[PDB]
Amino acid sequence: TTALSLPACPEESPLLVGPMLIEFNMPVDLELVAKQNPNVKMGGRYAPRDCVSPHKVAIIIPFRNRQEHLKYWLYYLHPVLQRQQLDYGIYVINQAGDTIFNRAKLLNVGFQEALKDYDYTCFVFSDVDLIPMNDHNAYRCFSQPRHISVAMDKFGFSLPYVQYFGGVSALSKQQFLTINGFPNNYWGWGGEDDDIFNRLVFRGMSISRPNAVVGRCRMIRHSRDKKNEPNPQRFDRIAHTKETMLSDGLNSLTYQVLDVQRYPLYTQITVDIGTPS
C-alpha cells in the first residue's frame, strides 16, 4: 500500500466571496462565533483539511483594553482567513500595566512568541480596529513586504502618502529578519510605522499593495462617529532609522511573558515590556 501526501493548496483560493458588508451595530457572542467556526481549534489555530497551504501565517495584534473591538475582529476575520485557505494562528499581544503603549515592541513579541508554537513563515501585523472589506485582500505574504490596509474608510479611502505603512501589513519571516524586526525604542514618540517602512527600503525592498478597491478596510467605530479623519503626515525618521535600525530590534527585544491563554478563537500573551528608560 502507498500513502499520498496532501496537495499544496492552489495559488488562488476558490472559496472567496469578494466584497463584504462590515458593520458594528450588533453584539458579538464569542461562543456563537466559535460554534459557527467549528474548524478553528484551541488558541485560534486553523489549517485546511483538503490541502497543504504554503501560507503559514501568525496574525499578531498589539493590544490593551480593547476587548469589545477584538470581538468584532474575530467575528469578521476568522471566516476570511479560512476562506483564504491559510495555515494560521491568532496572537493577541496584551501589554500589561499602565505605561505608554509600545506598539512595535509588542509586534516584535508576537513574532518571537508565535515562532515558539509553530514553524510560521509569514507574519501579519494588524491593528485590532481594522477589518478588511474584501476577502481578495490576502492576509499572507508576498515576494515583497505587503501593505494590506491601503484604503481605510477613516481616511476617505485615500492612501495618506505613498510611503504609508500603517494599519495592517504582512512580512515574510525573511523580510522581518533582514530588517532586524521592528524598533522597540519608539514608545510614544511617534513614527514607528515610518521607521519600519524606512528599514524595508534601506534593505532593498519595495512595498506591495493590493489594488485600492480590494484593499478597502473599515475602522471599528460607532456609526454616529463616522467621519474622515485628517490624513497623517509622514514622520521624519529616515536618518534616524538608518542610524539605529541595527541597534534597535530583535537584538534588543526585552520582555517577560506573564501569562498565556489559549482561548477558543485566539491566543493571548500578556507581557511586561518594561519602561521607556
Numbering used by the authors: 122 to 398
The study reports:
In the present work we used the wild-type human B4GalT1 and our construct is longer than the previously studied ones (Asp99-Ser398 instead of Ser126-Ser398). It contains a piece of the stem domain (Asp99-Leu125) in addition to the catalytic domain (Ser126-Ser398). We obtained two crystals with distinctly different shapes in the same crystallization conditions. In our open conformation structure of the human wild-type B4GalT1, the lid region, the most prominent ligand binding-controlling structural element, is detectable in its entirety. This was not the case in previously published structures of human open B4GalT1, containing mutations R337T, C338T and M340H. However, comparison of the lid positions can be made with the bovine open B4GalT1 structure, for which all residues could be traced in the electron density map. Even though the proteins have crystallized in different space groups and unit cells and the packing of molecules is different, the lid is observed in a similar orientation, except for residues 346–352, which are slightly displaced (RMSD ≈ 2.5 Å, data not shown). One noteworthy difference which is functionally important for ligand binding, is that in our open structure, Trp310 has a new and unexpected orientation with an RMSD of ≈ 2.0 Å compared with human closed structure. The Trp loop in the open structure lies in the vicinity of His361 and Tyr307 and makes short distance (<3.8Å) hydrophobic contacts with those residues as well as long range (≈7Å) hydrophobic contacts with Phe356.
